[PDB]
Symmetry: C3
């Protein structure tokens, strides 16, 4: 699985442990070992949400399976909670796009997962 967060919160406000915390928490939520988890955080971005420049986040979560109605509702709680606590972003200023990827459409280690 792969999680990306794009935010206008400055780099200095992203804690040093935030990528490891995300990795561990997403491993537990998705049921996948932490070695399979990739995380990417992009601070200092020029963005707006609802026409305001207050802290906000545009995120994506891609996984081969483990994406669906109930699972996504649960991920959104987990992730809004982490972004609220660690980056101080209000949960109503967060969008997470979820992508259920087909194994044939994910490349890794010179090949794909299919």
């Amino acid at each position: 699985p792969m999680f990306i967060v794009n935010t206008n919160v400055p780099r200095a406000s992203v804690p040093d442990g935030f990528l490891s915390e995300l990795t561990q928490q997403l491993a537990q939520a998705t049921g996948k070992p932490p070695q399979y988890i990739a995380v990417h955080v992009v601070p200092d971005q020029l963005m707006a949400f609802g026409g305001s420049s207050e802290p906000c986040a545009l995120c994506s979560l891609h996984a081969i399976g483990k994406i669906g109605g109930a699972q996504n509702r649960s991920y959104s709680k987990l992730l809004c909670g982490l972004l609220a606590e660690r980056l101080r972003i209000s949960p109503d200023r967060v969008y997470i796009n979820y992508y259920d990827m087909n194994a044939a459409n994910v490349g890794w280690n010179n090949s794909t997962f299919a």
Copy 2:
């Protein structure tokens, strides 16, 4: 809806007011209230289009519905027009990927839109 623009144009070329303008124009085009519109502009990127480093843009528009044949032509005219006028990027050096998101695959405030 969310609109992201990645561009090799420098940050100083992005006019004050561009994010508001995009928010207002996209609210009008998509028929969604400005409160749900997110916009993200990423200047100074290392990119090429057709092997040339002249101004270009790689963009994305995600929405839950409001995505389709005729609508996307209209958005492309709108968006390329803004990128031409405000950032001086030729329309033929722009790509916009359109994503019709399933409400179950969009997280927002501790839940999804489904």
Copy 3:
């Protein structure tokens, strides 16, 4: 087609010519003219793969058709090769998401395909 690579490798480690190379190699692999190939490289990123900060890459390839089982394996081999050789990123620290775009969902030159 458009290829984006996000990586924690520093900008100074991206060799002169890398975007031209990716353009030429992707034109060849996809069969599309180089004029329509876009490439975007984003170094110095804050990222982790498997909870480690060693060199890694998160990538995306979008194309209108030319995406599928066998083709995707061949692109992965080409692209992990390039990221290994040019950027010194191990292929087992790379993810590439492939997207088969509908022509109606790709805007260009004031209109869609």
